[PDB]
Structure formats: structure tokens, C-alpha cells
Assembly symmetry: C2
Homo-oligomer: 134 residues x 2
Amino acid sequence: SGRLVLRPWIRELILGSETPSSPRAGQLLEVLQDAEVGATLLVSDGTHSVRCLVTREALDTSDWFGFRGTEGRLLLLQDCGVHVQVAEGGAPAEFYLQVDRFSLLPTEQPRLRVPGCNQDLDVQKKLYDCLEEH
Amino acid sequence: SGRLVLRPWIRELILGSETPSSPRAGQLLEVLQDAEAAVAGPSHAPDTSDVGATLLVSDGTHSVRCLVTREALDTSDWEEKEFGFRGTEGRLLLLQDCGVHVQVAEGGAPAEFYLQVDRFSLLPTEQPRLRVPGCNQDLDVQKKLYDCLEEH
């Protein structure tokens, strides 16, 4: 017997050129900005983390209020899009996810630290390819 | 930096006194019966778009037969996804809408609990497939199965 695991997907979603059709599952690490604009979440795939912007569109077309309290729960991102926040205060630009539809999963688990996906060299190369063509 | 795990849920679901209000992730172990897509217009080719697909799904602890409904199959997006399931064994399957049903003995096979899936999604994650006992081989499940049977 054993347990089923989720495999990383964030880095692949960013390096890919196509928009994610199928959904992605990851763990909710932190609620940066909860819902009352959408909400800002820190999501992990076990290997990397990414800030996800859950649009208002997604908050309305959802079952269910507020994400705080579900930290550690798995999260289904049904509608994703990789975007680029541009450099502002000293900090460079970063990739992030805009989520237009999501769904909470039952599995709850301890939260483990993970590096940000923008710290990955392949991701970084691609970022500095978007900025030098935008 | 760690492994994200999925919580076993099949035995707890069947024994619980209610239906899965929320989605559940599992792994496709085997394809007992794949499903063909519906083709408009007559043909001398056998049509089976009435039958849905039948999968053996694991949750890491137990396995359970899943009947992926026709509705579920046609309300799905098959972009860069050959309509079907063979080839996806080892992939994570998310049952977004389902329920526990009883199957009375028939055709040589004894009564058992199984899941009807009216909506699913395929996750990218692929993983090794570990031998796992069927949930119906569980003592408490069997006791409930017979309890259910004694109500027809």
C-alpha cells in the first residue's frame, strides 16, 4: 500500500507555450489577499510556488466565503493563464497565474516550504525573453 | 522540498452515510471497458456510444470500479486528448461528480459497491501503479453491502 502523489506542474506550465486546457492541482500555502478585486494566493505543487490571482469571475462562478482557513488544502485550478507582472520597486518582473475558475479539494496536509518558481533558471530565461520582446 | 499527498477516501466514502459533496482524486489503475465517441449518421460499424467507460480507480489504499457515464463523457473536452482512456493508466483522475451505488450479483459476478461518475477531469500527474485490494474486499464494506442488499 502507499499514497498517491501530485507531481510538479508549475514550471512546465510556464515554459510551455500553449494555454493550459486541463486543470492543475496544488496545495494552498498562503492567502496573500483574501476575497471581500479577486484574491491573491500562494500555491505550491510540491516543488515550486506561484502567486495565483483568483479573478472575481472565478469567485462568483464557484460553489462555496474567503480562503483563509483552508490553508493546507489541495486546490483545483480549472482555468489558468500564465502572466507577467512587470518590475516596479527594485524587484524584477515575475510570472504568476491568473485563475478564472477553481474548486477546493478535501485533502488537507501540512504546508512545506518551497522555492518560488521564478527562482528556477529555465523560468528566468523565459522571463527575460518576454521582457526583451515587450 | 517534500511530497504532496492525496488522502485515501474510497472506504470512508462507502461507509459514510451521505454522498461525496466534494471532488475526489484517484489514479486510473486499469481500463476495464474504454468508450468510443458518438458518430452521427448510420453505419454498419457497431455503435457503442450508449455504453460509458468502466475504469478501476485507486486511492492508494483500495481500488473501486468506476462507471464513467455517457453524460460525463460527452460533457468533456477532448483537446489533444484522444476520446478514450487507454494509455492514461497511471494518471490522476479527478471525480468531480459521483455517487456510490450497489450492483446486485449478475453474470457470475457477486454484488459489489461501485461508483458512478457523471463528471470527471484528467490531471497531468502520472505515477507508478501499486497493487491494491478492492474496497469490496474490506470487512466493514461487505457488512454494509449486505445491509444495503437487504432492502430491495
